[PDB]
Design a protein around this ligand. Structure first.
Ligand SMILES: OC[C@H]1O[C@@](CO)(OC[C@H]2O[C@@](CO)(OC[C@H]3O[C@@](CO)(OC[C@H]4O[C@@](CO[C@]5(CO)O[C@H](CO)[C@@H](O)[C@@H]5O)(OC[C@H]5O[C@@](CO)(OC[C@H]6O[C@](O)(CO)[C@@H](O)[C@@H]6O)[C@@H](O)[C@@H]5O)[C@@H](O)[C@@H]4O)[C@@H](O)[C@@H]3O)[C@@H](O)[C@@H]2O)[C@@H](O)[C@@H]1O
Ligand SMILES: [Cl-]
Ligand SMILES: [Mg+2]
Lengths: 921, 552, 99, 50
C-alpha cells in the first residue's frame, strides 16, 4: 500500500536468527511493532502494534496467502515465508479484515517463478546455555544471613530448629559479630535427608540442542507453477524436561487455463508440533528452596524438606514428574481460489480458506513425597482433546483503469468467517503402575470426571476500497467497510468503518527539476476507523452454568452448585443447580479504533540513504470491556459493556544506508527507532477501583498509561533511632527499616501516602542491523535497545530482605549478604530481620528499577564458496555460516537482576551458538 | 447474510431468559445452599475464624507473621489497611452468598402456591440463608448494605448505601428475614441441611441479642441495652419452640466435633460438608484447610492461646478462676481443669483428637512456628488422621459439619438476655448455665482414662442457685461462653457486642506478649478496631454512597 | 429418565518409510531387472472418551460434559505395532519369449 | 489439484454421509533428469450419522 504506513520486512534477514518463529526474528526489526517472548523452545511470541490498542485483545491479524488467522506463526514453517509487511495505521490495514484494529501482518509464502526449477536445502544446529543465572545463597551464606537476621532482632541465633550451631560474640563496640559455625550431617532427627550444598539452578538446567532442516523445491511453466516445502525443528529447552518439535510440509500450486483468463490455485501447509512445557513457577521454586536440601534422600528417593525447613518442593522432581505431559498439535492451513478475467482490467476472484487444528495430550499426575511435601498417594491421568476448525470464504471484484493521465482501482466484495471450537477430556484416578504405558483411563481403579464444551462465532463483512493517482504525482485512496458479527444482537451487529488516505509524490512535481540529490519524496496522511469485536463468544448473554463442582480448585472456592441437602455426608450423587457467570448486555456494539497518521518517505543519493517517518494518533472508543460487578451484586455480576477509551500517539522512524567501497567491502545499514505515549481516557467505575488496568485499586488509571502503578516512596532506610522519632509516625519503623515518605504531610505514614511510581512505557525503543560483505565473507549483526522502560522487580523481595516472603526460611538472593547493620552502614539494603514489621513488602519505589537494555540480538558470519568452485559441484549456492543469538546484554547499573528484558520468573532467555549451511541448486 | 450469524447459540449454559422457569426453581434453592460449602476458601472460612484471631482464644499461627500478613495485622490491631485484600475478600464473598439466595427468591416469588405447596417454606429457607449472610456481614463490618430486594435489577445496586438504614434498622432488617423463616419453616426438616423452625427461632433470637447492645451513637461504643429486644431473645429460645424440633444438648460434649455424630440433636443448623459425592475431591470444609497441624505437613493455623488454655482451669470446688486463672500456666499435675479443655485444645503430651497413637509434642512434627505461635492445636475442626472423612486435596479437608448454631449457644443466649433483663429470672439463667456446665462436668467419654494415664484432675461443678447480682451472675455467664465456644470464632464477636473489646484484648495483649512475641507491638484502638473497615474498593466505587466506620 | 453424553475421540497415526535400489539391464538378446530394499511401518493408535449423565436441557447445545449434574466415567487406551521388512525381487526375459 | 464433495442422504431417515476431499500431487525433475523429488497428498473430512 503506497498511501499507508507500512513497515516492510527483509525476509532474508529473518532466517539469520534461526528462530523457529518468524515473528521472533522480527523482534525489534520494525518500529512501532513490539515483539516480546521468553526463552522457551517453541519460540512463541506476542506482537503489539502501536502501543496498546484496546482493553481486550491486542494481538495483530496475520493474512497468510490471503487467509486470516490471529494465532500461530510458531506453529508453521517460518522457512517458506517470502514476504512480510506490517501495516500499522488504520487505512492500510482496514480492508484486510474485520479485525485490523491491532494491526495487520501480510505474509506471503514462496512459490515457483516462470521458467525456474530451483531447490534449496538449509540446515542448522545450535547449542543453548543458561545466561541469566540468578545468584542465590549457598548453605554457608544462608547460615551467615540467618545468624545476622537472628541477632539483628536480638534473639538467640542458635534457636533455629535447623542444623546450625553458632560461635559468636561482641566486638569492641558491642555489636553482634560472627566467628564460626557448625552444621549437622542430616537435616532431620531421623537422619533420612543428608544436609547438602546444591546449586538448584545448575541442577534444573542443561545445555539445549537446537536443530533445523528445510528443503524447498519449485517449478515454473508458462501455464502454471508449483511449490513443495519440507521441514523439521527440534529445540531441547534450557530447562530440563522441556522441548519442542515441528514437522512441516507445504504444497502451493496455480494453473492458468483458457489462455491466461481463468486461473485456479491453492496454498496449503501441514504441521505436527509437539511440546512438553516448563511447569508453572518452577523458576520461583528454584529461587526459594535452600541449598541445604539434597537432590536425593539417603535412600533412592527425591529430596525435600524435613524437620524445620520451608514448604517448598523439589524442582528436579517436578520437572521430571512433568516430563511425560506432552501435547501434540496437528494444524492444517491453506486456501483455494479461482480468478476470472472476463475482459482486461476486470477480475472476479474468490478464495476459500481452512484453518483446522487438533491438539491431543495426556497429563499425568504421579504420587510424590519429597520430605514433608506430600501429595497423599494421588495418581491420575487426564486425556485432553481440543479442536479449532476455522474457515473463511470471500469473493472479490476489481476494475483497474489507466485513462492516460490518470490511474484508478476499484474493489468490492464480501467475506464470511466461522470458527467452531470444541474441547473434551476424561480424567481418572488411581493406578497400580505409574508409567505412561499403564496410565490410561481404562486402567483406573478410582473416581473419574468428564469435561468439555464448545463455542464459536460467525463473521460477515461487506467491503469496498477505491484508489486513484493523477500522474504519479497525487495519490488518493478510500475504503468503506460494513462488518457484522455473531457476538452482538441484531440491533448492533453491523457497524460502518470508513477510511481515507492521501499521497503527494513531491519529486514528480517537476517544480523540483533542480534537486538531483533526492530521488523520491512522498507525503501521506491517513484517517480511518477499524472495528473491534474481539470479545467473549458469550458477552451478550446472562450466563447461568450448572457447575456441579467437578473441577479442581485451590484452597476451596469451586463455587459449585452441588450440596448434600440431606445430611448424608455424600456417598452418591448430590443435588445441584446453577450459578450465575455473567449478566447480559443487549446493547453491546462494536468498539471503534480511529487512527490518524501522517508520514513522509524519502530516497537520497543514488538511492542510498532511504527511510520514512510516521506520526499517529490511535484512539479506541466505545471500548469493549469486561466490567466487574458491584460488590453487593455478588456472584457473576461481570458484564460486557462499551464503556472506556484509550489513545496511543507516537513516532516511527526507519532509515538505512547502502553503499559499496572500492576495496571490495560492501556495507549496508538498517536502523529504526520508535517511541509512543499511551493514555487511558475513560473507564467504568468498577474497572477503575478494580485497578485491573492500573490503579492497584488505590487510585484510578484514567489519565495514566495502561498498566501504570501506585505505591509508597522509599526515602532510604532509617540509620539511627532519632531519624525514626523525627519521621512521621510509621508503624513498625526502627533503625534498620525502610523510611516511607509522607506525601500529605499529615504526620503519619498510612495508606494515603501513595503516588504514581511505575510507568511501563519506554521513552523510545530502537533496533539497528549492520551488514558487511567482503570477498565472499558476509557478516551480520542486529542490535536492539529499549531505553526508558521501568521494571517492577519481584526478585528484589527475595534478595533484599530475610522476610519479604510469605513463609519463613526460603532461600534468598545474594544481595542481603550486604544488608545494613551497625557493623556495615554503607548500604541501601535494609538490615536483616526475621519479621516484616515495617511491611517492606508493600508496593515501594524500592522494587521499581531501570530495566533499560541493549542486546546483541544476533550476530552471524559466513563464507560463500565462489560460484566457480560450487558450480562444478553443479550448485548455484553453497554457504557455510555460524551465529550467536542474545550473545550479550547491556543494562543499567541500578538494575539488580540479570536479564532486564526478563527480570523475574519467565523462561530464561538463553544464548545460542549455531552452525549451518545453505546448499542451493 | 442473516441466517448465518444466528446459527451459533451458547453451549452448556442456561440463559437469563430460562433460569426463571419453574423446572429450575428448586435448582436455585440448592445452588443457594451450596455456596455455603463451596464459596469459602482457606482465608475466608464462612466460619469467620481467620478473623477470630483478633480474639484471646487463639493466634493465627502458620510460618510467621507474613504467612497471611493482613491477618496478623487484625490479630495485633495494628497495621490494618482498608485496601487490604482480605477485607475486600470476605465482603465480596458474603454478598455472593446473597445473590444465590436472592436469585432463588426472584424465581420463587413468581411461583403459585396451589401447584407448588412448598413455595413459602422454600422462600423461608432462602430468606433464612439471606439473614445468615447479612448477620455475619454485619458482625464483620457494622455498616453494611442491606440487599433484601430480590426483584431489584442489576443497575439498582449502585444506588444502594450502607447508611440507608440506621445501625438498628440494619439489625431489624436481618431479623425481618429470620422472623419470616420462623413463621413458615416446617417444624422438622427431614432433609437435614435445610433449617427447621427452631433454627430460625435460634438465629432470630441471636440477631436480637446482637441488636440490643445498641450503638445508636456515631462511634462503636454502647448507647444502652434495649429492653424490648432482649424480651425477644427469650421469646424465640422458649424451651417449647426447641422441643418441637427435638433439639437438645449432646450427651458428651465431644460429639459436636466428631464426624460419626454429624447432625446430632445439638446441631440446630449446620453446613453439610460431604465426601465421595460426585465433586472433584468432595465438598469438604476447605475453609479449615489451614488449621491442620504439621503432622500432615502443613499448615498449622488457628492455634489456641495460653490465655484460653488457662481459661479451662478451675478452683478447689470446680468453678473457674475468674480473678487469677492467667497468672501461672496450667500444669496438669496440680491444677483442676474443665474436661472441655481436652475437647477444644490438643496440647503437648496428649492425644490428637482422641487417638492415643498421635501424641502431640513441642516439635517440628506439630508446630510450624519454631515456637513463636506456641505448640497448641485446634481440635474442634480437625479430625482423627485415620478418619475415612479426611482427604488431601490442595489442603487437608474433611466432611465434618460446621455447626452454625449449637444448641448450647441458644441456652447461653437465653441465660444472657435473662441476666440483662434482671427481672428475677436470674435463677433461670443459672439453671441454663448449669445445664451447659454439668454436661461438661461429665464429658469424659473418649478421655475417661486421662487421670491414671496422665494425672489430669477433672473438677467442674454447677453453681449453687441464689439470687445473684446482675454483674456477678454475668461473669459466670461470660466464663461459660468462653469455655463452651472456644476456638469456634465467635469470641471476639462476643466482646465487640459487650463493648469490652478494647479492654480485655488490650489486657490480653500484655499478658500474652510473655507467651507469644507477636503481641509485643500490639494495640487495640477504641472506636475503630471493633469492626473491620468497610473495604476501600467498595467505598471508592459507590460514589460517596458508602460510609466508613468511626476511626479511619 | 436417563440422559447422558459421551464425547469420543480416536486417533490412528500410521507411517511408512522404505528405500529401494534397482538396476535394469538390456544385454541385447536378454533383459533383466533387480530390486532390493527395506521398509518400516509403525501404526500408533489411541482413543479416549468422557461420559457424563443428567442434563437439565436435552439438546446437543446444552448437552456437553461440563453441563452434567450426574455421575461420570472416563475411558481410553492405546496400542500399536511396528513392521520391518527386507526384500528383493529379480526379473528376466530371454527375448520376449521366455520370462 | 483435485477438489471434491459428496453428500448421500440415506434411505433410512436420520442417516447421512458427506465427504470433502482435496488432493495435491507434484513432482520435480532436477539436475537434468537425474534427481527427482515428488509428493502425493489427499485431505478428507467425512462425516456421518449411521
Ligand atoms: O500477595 C497478594 C496476593 O494474595 C492473593 C493470592 O495469594 O490472595 C487471594 C486468595 O489467594 C489465597 C489462596 O488461594 O492466597 C493464599 C494466602 O494464604 C496464606 C496465608 O493466608 O497461606 C497459604 C499457605 O498455603 C501454602 C501451602 O503450600 C502447599 C501445602 O499444601 O505446599 C505446596 C507449596 O505451595 C502446595 O502445593 C501446597 O499448596 O502455600 C501456598 C501459597 O504459597 C504460594 C506462594 O507463591 O504458593 C506457593 C507456590 O509459589 C511458588 O513459588 C510459585 O508457584 C511455588 O514455590 C509454590 O507452588 C501462594 O501462591 C500460595 O497461595 C503454605 O505455604 C501457606 O502457609 C498466604 O501465605 C497466601 O498468600 C487466599 O488467601 C485468597 O483468598 C491475591 O489477592 C494476590 O495475588
Ligand atoms: Cl439472556
Ligand atoms: Mg500520610
Amino acid at each position: 500500500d503506497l498511501t499507508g504506513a507500512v513497515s516492510v520486512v527483509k525476509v532474508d534477514e529473518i532466517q539469520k536468527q534461526g528462530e523457529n518463529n518468524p515473528v521472533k526474528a522480527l523482534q525489534g526489526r520494525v518500529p512501532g511493532m513490539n515483539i516480546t517472548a521468553d526463552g522457551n523452545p517453541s519460540g512463541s511470541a506476542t506482537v503489539r502494534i502501536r502501543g496498546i490498542g484496546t482493553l481486550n485483545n491486542n494481538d495483530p491479524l496475520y493474512i497468510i496467502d490471503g487467509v486470516p488467522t490471529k494465532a500461530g506463526m510458531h506453529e508453521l514453517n517460518g522457512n517458506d515465508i517470502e514476504s512480510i509487511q506490517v501495516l500499522k495505521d488504520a487505512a492500510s490495514a482496514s480492508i484486510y479484515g474485520s479485525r485490523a484494529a491491532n494491526g495487520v501482518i501480510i505474509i506471503t509464502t514462496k512459490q515457483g517463478k516462470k521458467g525456474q526449477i530451483k531447490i534449496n536445502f538449509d540446515a542448522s544446529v545450535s547449542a543453548s546455555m543458561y545466561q541469566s543465572k540468578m545468584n542465590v545463597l549457598n548453605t554457608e551464606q544462608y547460615g551467615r544471613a540467618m545468624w545476622q537476621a537472628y541477632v539483628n532482632d536480638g534473639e538467640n541465633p542458635n534457636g533455629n530448629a535447623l542444623g546450625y550451631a553458632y560461635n559468636w560474640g561482641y566486638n569492641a563496640d558491642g555489636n553482634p559479630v560472627l566467628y564460626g559455625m557448625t552444621l549437622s550431617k542430616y537435616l532431620d532427627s531421623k537422619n533420612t535427608m543428608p544436609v547438602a550444598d546444591t546449586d538448584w539452578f545448575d541442577e534444573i538446567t542443561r545445555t539445549g540442542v537446537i536443530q533445523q532442516y528445510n528443503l524447498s523445491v519449485s517449478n515454473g511453466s508458462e501455464k502454471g507453477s508449483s511449490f513443495f516445502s519440507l521441514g523439521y525443528y527440534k529445540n531441547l529447552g534450557v530447562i530440563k524436561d522441556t522441548d519442542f518439535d515441528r514437522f512441516s510440509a507445504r504444497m502451493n500450486s496455480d494453473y492458468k487455463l483458457i489462455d491466461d483468463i481463468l486461473t485456479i490455485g491453492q496454498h496449503f501447509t501441514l504441521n505436527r508440533t509437539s511440546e512438553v512445557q516448563a511447569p508453572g513457577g518452577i523458576i520461583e521454586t528454584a529461587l526459594d528452596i535452600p541449598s541445604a536440601i539434597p537432590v536425593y534422600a539417603s535412600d533412592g528417593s527425591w529430596g525435600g524438606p524435613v524437620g524445620g525447613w520451608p514448604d517448598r518442593r523439589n524442582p528436579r522432581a517436578v520437572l521430571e514428574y512433568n516430563k511425560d505431559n506432552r501435547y501434540t498439535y496437528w494444524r492444517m492451513f491453506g486456501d483455494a481460489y479461482v480468478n476470472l478475467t472476463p475482459f482486461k482490467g476486470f477480475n472476479l476472484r474468490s478464495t476459500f480458506g481452512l484453518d483446522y487444528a487438533n491438539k491431543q495430550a495426556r497429563y499425568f499426575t504421579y504420587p510424590y513425597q519429597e520430605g514433608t511435601q506430600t501429595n497423599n498417594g494421588k495418581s491420575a491421568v487426564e486425556a485432553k482433546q481440543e479442536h479449532w476448525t476455522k474457515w473463511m470464504w470471500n469473493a472479490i471484484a476489481t476494475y483497474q483503469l489507466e485513462v492516460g493521465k490518470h490511474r484508478g482501482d476499484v474493489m468490492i466484495g464480501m467475506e464470511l468467517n466461522r470458527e467452531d471450537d470444541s474441547h473434551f477430556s476424561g480424567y481418572k484416578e488411581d493406578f497400580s503402575i505409574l508409567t505412561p504405558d499403564y496410565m490410561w483411563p481404562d486402567a483406573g481403579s478410582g473416581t473419574a470426571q468428564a469435561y468439555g464444551a464448545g463455542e464459536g462465532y460467525s463473521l460477515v463483512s461487506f467491503f469496498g476500497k477505491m484508489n486513484y493517482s493523477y500522474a504519479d504525482r497525487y495519490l488518493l485512496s478510500l475504503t468503506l467497510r460494513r462488518d457484522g458479527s455473531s457476538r452482538f444482537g441484531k440491533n448492533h451487529r453491523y457497524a460502518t468503518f470508513p477510511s481515507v488516505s492521501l499521497g503527494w509524490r513531491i519529486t514528480q512535481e517537476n517544480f523540483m527539476k533542480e534537486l538531483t540529490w533526492l530521488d523520491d519524496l512522498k507525503l501521506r496522511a491517513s484517517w480511518g476507523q477499524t472495528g473491534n469485536q474481539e470479545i467473549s463468544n458469550l458477552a451478550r448473554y446472562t450466563i447461568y452454568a450448572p457447575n456441579y463442582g467437578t473441577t479442581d480448585s485451590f484452597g476451596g472456592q469451586s463455587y459449585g452448585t452441588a450440596y448434600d441437602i440431606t445430611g448424608s455426608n455424600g456417598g452418591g450423587v448430590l443435588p445441584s443447580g446453577f450459578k450465575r457467570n455473567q449478566i447480559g448486555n443487549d446493547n453491546i456494539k462494536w468498539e471503534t479504533t480511529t487512527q490518524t497518521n501522517v508520514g513522509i518517505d524519502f530516497s537520497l543519493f543514488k538511492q542510498s540513504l532511504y527511510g520514512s517517518l510516521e506520526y499517529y494518533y490511535k484512539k479506541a472508543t466505545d471500548i469493549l470491556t469486561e466490567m466487574a460487578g458491584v460488590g453487593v451484586l455478588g456472584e457473576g455480576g461481570s458484564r460486557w459493556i462499551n464503556s472506556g477509551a484509550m489513545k496511543n500517539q507516537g513516532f516511527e522512524f526507519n532509515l538505512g544506508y547502502r553503499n559499496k567501497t572500492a576495496f571490495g567491502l560492501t556495507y549496508d545499514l538498517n536502523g529504526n527507532i520508535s517511541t509512543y505515549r499511551n493514555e487511558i481516557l475513560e473507564l467504568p467505575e468498577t474497572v477503575a477501583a478494580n485497578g485491573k488496568f492500573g490503579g492497584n485499586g488505590v487510585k484510578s488509571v484514567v489519565g495514566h498509561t495502561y498498566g501504570a502503578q501506585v505505591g509508597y516512596i522509599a526515602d532510604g532506610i532509617f540509620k539511627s533511632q532519632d531519624e525514626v522519632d523525627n519521621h512521621a509516625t510509621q508503624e513498625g519503623a526502627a533503625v534498620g527499616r525502610i523510611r516511607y515518605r509522607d506525601i500529605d504531610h499529615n504526620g503519619v505514614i498510612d495508606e494515603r501516602d501513595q503516588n504514581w511510581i511505575y510507568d511501563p512505557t519506554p521513552s523510545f525503543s530502537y533496533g539497528l542491523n549492520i551488514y558487511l560483505e567482503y570477498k565472499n565473507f558476509d557478516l551480520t549483526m542486529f542490535w536492539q535497545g529499549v531505553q526508558g522502560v521501568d521494571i517492577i522487580s519481584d526478585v528484589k523481595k527475595k534478595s533484599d530482605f530475610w522476610s519479604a516472603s510469605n513463609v519463613g526460611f526460603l532461600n534468598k538472593g545474594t544481595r542481603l549478604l550486604n544488608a545494613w547493620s551497625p557493623t556495615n552502614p554503607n548500604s541501601d539494603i535494609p538490615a536483616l530481620t526475621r519479621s516484616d514489621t515495617n511491611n517492606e513488602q508493600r508496593v515501594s519505589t524500592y522494587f521499581v528499577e531501570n530495566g533499560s537494555f541493549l542486546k546483541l540480538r544476533n550476530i552471524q558470519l559466513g563464507y560463500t564458496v565462489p560460484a566457480v568452485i560450487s558450480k562444478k559441484m553443479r550448485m548455484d549456492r553453497l554457504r557455510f555460516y555460524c551465529s550467536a543469538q542474545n550473545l550479550l546484554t547491556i543494562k543499567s547499573k541500578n538494575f539488580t537482576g540479570e536479564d532486564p528484558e526478563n527480570p523475574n520468573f519467565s523462561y530464561p532467555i538463553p544464548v545460542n551458538i549455531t552452525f549451518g549451511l545453505n546448499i542451493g541448486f | 447474510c442473516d441466517d448465518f450469524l444466528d446459527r451459533q447459540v451458547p453451549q452448556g449454559i442456561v440463559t437469563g431468559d430460562q433460569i426463571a422457569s419453574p423446572e429450575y426453581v428448586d435448582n436455585l434453592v440448592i445452588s443457594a445452599y451450596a455456596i455455603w460449602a463451596t464459596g469459602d476458601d482457606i482465608n475466608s472460612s464462612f466460619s469467620l475464624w481467620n478473623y477470630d484471631v483478633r480474639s484471646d482464644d487463639c493466634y493465627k499461627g502458620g510460618s510467621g507473621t507474613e504467612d497471611g500478613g493482613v491477618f496478623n495485622a487484625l490479630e495485633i490491631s495494628k497495621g490494618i489497611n482498608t485496601t487490604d485484600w482480605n477485607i475486600n475478600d470476605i465482603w465480596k464473598r458474603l454478598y455472593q452468598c446473597i445473590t444465590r439466595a436472592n436469585t432463588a427468591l426472584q424465581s420463587l416469588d413468581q411461583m403459585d402456591e396451589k401447584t407448588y405447596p412448598l413455595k413459602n417454606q422454600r422462600i423461608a429457607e432462602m430468606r433464612f440463608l439471606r439473614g445468615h449472610a447479612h448477620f455475619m456481614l454485619k458482625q464483620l463490618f457494622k455498616k453494611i448494605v442491606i440487599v433484601n430486594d430480590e426483584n431489584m435489577e442489576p443497575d439498582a445496586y449502585n444506588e444502594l448505601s450502607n447508611t440507608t438504614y440506621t445501625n438498628d434498622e440494619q439489625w431489624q432488617k436481618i431479623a425481618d428475614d429470620f422472623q419470616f423463616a420462623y413463621d413458615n419453616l416446617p417444624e422438622v426438616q427431614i432433609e437435614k441441611g435445610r433449617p427447621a423452625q427452631a433454627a430460625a427461632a435460634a438465629y432470630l433470637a441471636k440477631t436480637y441479642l446482637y441488636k440490643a447492645y445498641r450503638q445508636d451513637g456515631a462511634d462503636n461504643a454502647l448507647t444502652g441495652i434495649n429492653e424490648e429486644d432482649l424480651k425477644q431473645v427469650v421469646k424465640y429460645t422458649d424451651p417449647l419452640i426447641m422441643a418441637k424440633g427435638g433439639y437438645g444438648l449432646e450427651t458428651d460434649y465431644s460429639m459436636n466435633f466428631l464426624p460419626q455424630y454429624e447432625n446430632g440433636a445439638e446441631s440446630v443448623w449446620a453446613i453439610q460438608y460431604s465426601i465421595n459425592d460426585g465433586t472433584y475431591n468432595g465438598n469438604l470444609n476447605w475453609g479449615m484447610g489451614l488449621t491442620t497441624p504439621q503432622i500432615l505437613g502443613c499448615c498449622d493455623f488457628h492455634k489456641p492461646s495460653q490465655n484460653l488454655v488457662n481459661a479451662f482451669k478451675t478452683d478447689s470446688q470446680g468453678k473457674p478462676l475468674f480473678s487469677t486463672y492467667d497468672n501461672e500456666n496450667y500444669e496438669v499435675a496440680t491444677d483442676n481443669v474443665d474436661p472441655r479443655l481436652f475437647h477444644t485444645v490438643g496440647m503437648p503430651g496428649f492425644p490428637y483428637k482422641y487417638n492415643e497413637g498421635y501424641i502431640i509434642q513441642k516439635n517440628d512434627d506439630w508446630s510450624r512456628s519454631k515456637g513463636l505461635y506456641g505448640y497448641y492445636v485446634s481440635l474442634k475442626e480437625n479430625v482423627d488422621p485415620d478418619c475415612d472423612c479426611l482427604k488431601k486435596g490442595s489442603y487437608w479437608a474433611s466432611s465434618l459439619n460446621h455447626i452454625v448454631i449449637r444448641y448450647a449457644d441458644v441456652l447461653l443466649m437465653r441465660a444472657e438476655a435473662l441476666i440483662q433483663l434482671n427481672d428475677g429470672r436470674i435463677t433461670d439463667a443459672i439453671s441454663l448455665i448449669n445445664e451447659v456446665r454439668s454436661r461438661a462436668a461429665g464429658s469424659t467419654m473418649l478421655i475417661f482414662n486421662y487421670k491414671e494415664d496422665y494425672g489430669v484432675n477433672f473438677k467442674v461443678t454447677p453453681y449453687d442457685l441464689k439470687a445473684y447480682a446482675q454483674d456477678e451472675a454475668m461473669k459466670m455467664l461470660k466464663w461459660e461462653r468462653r469455655v463452651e465456644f472456644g476456638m469456634e470464632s465467635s469470641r471476639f464477636f462476643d466482646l465487640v457486642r459487650w463493648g469490652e473489646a478494647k479492654d480485655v484484648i488490650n489486657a490480653y495483649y500484655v499478658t500474652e506478649a510473655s507467651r507469644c512475641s507477636i503481641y509485643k507491638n500490639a494495640g487495640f484502638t477504641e472506636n475503630k478496631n471493633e469492626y473491620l473497615p468497610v473495604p476501600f474498593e467498595q467505598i471508592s466505587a459507590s460514589n460517596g454512597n458508602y460510609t466508613q466506620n468511626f476511626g479511619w
